[PDB]
RNA sequence: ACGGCCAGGGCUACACACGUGCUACAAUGGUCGGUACAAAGGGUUGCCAAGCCGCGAGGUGGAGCUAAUCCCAUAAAACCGAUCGUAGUCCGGAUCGCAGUCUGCAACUCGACUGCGUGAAGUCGGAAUCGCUAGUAAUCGUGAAUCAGAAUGUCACGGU
């Protein structure tokens, strides 16, 4: 949401509890990839876009279908060609973004503990599981086997590691 | 069979360096002689080590155990 | 959602529960006194009497939800060294069936 | 083997060696009259009191050979002995038919 | 001293051929509590009612305590058996029954109780050979101790 519980409430305090000086040192949130790891049996050229399938009912948006660098010869063989796959959705769509997992659907399986203690690499650490390609809303039992990955962390968008820890976090959800 | 048809475990000459062994701290293994004996189910957290005439093996006992018998802390064929 | 999988026609009501595994003898008073009746398919009939048949799914175990703690009991046999997980790191039987070697349908591959 | 045919052999007087405190421990228990604080009063009963008064070890033989197998309910004697016993008379009624 | 014995546990990595030797070929089609209906002996430390318990558990009960008695005492592959009329699947559950007043001083991560929500490999037997000339090739079960009742390929009668 973009409303009572963002615009009156996450800006005001955020200055004083840092003790920071002027307004616009909040964060913000943007990016992060999908990078499903197309790069196994990448040599198919049908069914990268069933990651295009898999991206587009549950998340309303086209993908790039992003080529890579190398040649390289260790990790796989470069004839499976693009192995990249991303999407940027809205801040006029952060309303839903903020309500489509730890909201309403934080179980992707299950984690067996939540606890946001330890990782203190220092770049805005929390601690919650999304990386199932099931878990979406508008999805049937079985028409696709679509098993496919999503990968999510968070980094810094601001100076230091306390300034996206309440920032992070919108409901008390752990 | 093997319900619960006997509820409790009162069996007294099994028993006597066991429930006076509360009071005192716990520094020292109760040894068992016998592939059989077992304990209270209100003192959990003990150490019984699997008895036949060897050599003792590692035993580690959490708070949620109900069904059976020791015999799995040592195996009853042990892979030799 | 209808009952849980697709569910393929041209069979029985009742063995459309009696779907492999908890059934027929406890359900032998639930298709009889809700008045949906057995005689004809789940389909073909009115599409009502099934809103009671299909609530049983989410309330005791899933097809979904039976996969969350396929994995949690067994992770309680595996590193607390025991011997349930003694014949599980080795694939035997383990409630004690025919022990070594030549058993039929309890081993696999 | 010499001291193993009169230690087992000795079970006759030591299994029911108190053999009155062994029946006014073992009818009760199968009854359920017995009150909610009362389970542990008929638990004081025959092991500590030394262990020789259950029957789980115990084993039927013969007895001028003492074989166990080919003992039957009809005799006190084994399989090595019916081939040689009526027909020197030492079993009553044992007749052949059809 | 294998004349001492309360014995300080370390005999199945699946990595195979198989002495192979009931069971089906998904269609007579996929899940029960019903039919003219088994029913006596050993039975003075035993066999353990109609059960009140039951969907299916017949521990307190107890008709039988020396059995032309009975405890497992209920039953037989029949009529036309249902919706729908020919399937490697709505015969499919191998580690995740947890847990339920019965031997009774000895069920602290494992047992009957099959309630079927699940996790499969059963498609004319061909390379060649177990082997069938007459009551035969052939698919209805055992009750009882030295006096305590889970003794399975050769089962008291396979009514073909």
């Known amino acids: 949401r973009l409303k009572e519980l963002y615009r009156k409430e996450i800006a005001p305090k955020l200055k004083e509890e840092l003790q920071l000086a002027n307004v616009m040192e909040v964060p913000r949130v943007t990016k992060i990839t999908l990078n499903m790891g197309l790069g196994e049996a990448v040599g198919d050229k049908k069914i990268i876009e069933n990651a295009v399938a898999d991206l587009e009912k549950i998340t309303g948006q086209k993908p790039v279908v992003t080529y890579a660098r190398k040649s390289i010869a260790g990790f796989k063989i470069r004839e499976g060609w693009p192995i990249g796959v991303k999407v940027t959705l809205r801040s006029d769509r952060m309303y839903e973004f903020l309500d489509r997992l730890l909201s309403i659907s934080l179980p992707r399986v299950r984690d067996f503990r939540g606890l946001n203690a330890k990782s203190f690499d220092g770049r805005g650490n929390y601690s919650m599981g999304v990386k199932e390609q099931i878990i979406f809303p508008e999805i049937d039992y079985d028409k696709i086997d679509a098993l496919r990955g999503l990968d999510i962390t968070l980094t810094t968008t601001a100076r230091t590691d306390d300034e996206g820890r309440a920032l992070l976090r919108a409901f008390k959800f752990p | ?80 | 959602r209808i009952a849980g999988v697709n569910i393929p026609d041209n069979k029985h009501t009742v063995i459309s529960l009696t779907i492999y595994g908890v059934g027929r003898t406890t359900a032998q008073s639930i298709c009889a006194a809700t008045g949906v009746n057995p005689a004809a398919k789940i389909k073909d009939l009115s599409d009502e009497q099934i809103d009671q048949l299909r609530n049983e799914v989410a309330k005791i175990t899933t097809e979904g939800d039976l996969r969350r703690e396929i994995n949690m009991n067994i992770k309680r046999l595996m590193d607390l060294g025991c011997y349930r997980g003694l014949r599980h790191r080795r694939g035997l039987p383990v409630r004690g069936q025919r022990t070594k070697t030549n058993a039929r349908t309890r081993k696999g591959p | 083997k010499e001291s193993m045919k009169n230690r087992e052999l000795k079970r006759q007087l030591t299994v029911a060696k108190y053999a009155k405190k062994r029946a006014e421990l073992k009818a009760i228990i199968a009854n359920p009259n017995s009150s909610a604080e009362e389970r542990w009063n008929a638990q004081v009963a025959l092991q500590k009191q030394p262990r020789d008064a259950s029957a789980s070890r115990l084993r039927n033989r013969c007895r001028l050979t003492g074989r166990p197998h080919g003992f039957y309910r009809k005799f006190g004697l084994s399989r090595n002995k019916l081939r040689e016993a009526a027909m020197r008379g030492d079993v009553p009624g044992l007749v052949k038919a059809s």
């Open chain 2, 1 to 80: 069979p093997r319900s619960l048809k006997k509820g409790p475990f009162i069996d007294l000459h099994l028993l006597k360096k066991v429930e006076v062994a509360v009071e005192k701290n716990d520094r020292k293994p109760i040894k068992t002689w016998s592939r059989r004996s077992m304990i209270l189910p209100h003192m959990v957290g003990l150490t019984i080590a699997v008895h036949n005439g060897r050599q003792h093996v590692p035993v580690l006992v959490n708070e949620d155990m109900v069904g059976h018998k020791l015999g799995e802390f040592a195996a009853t064929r042990t892979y030799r």
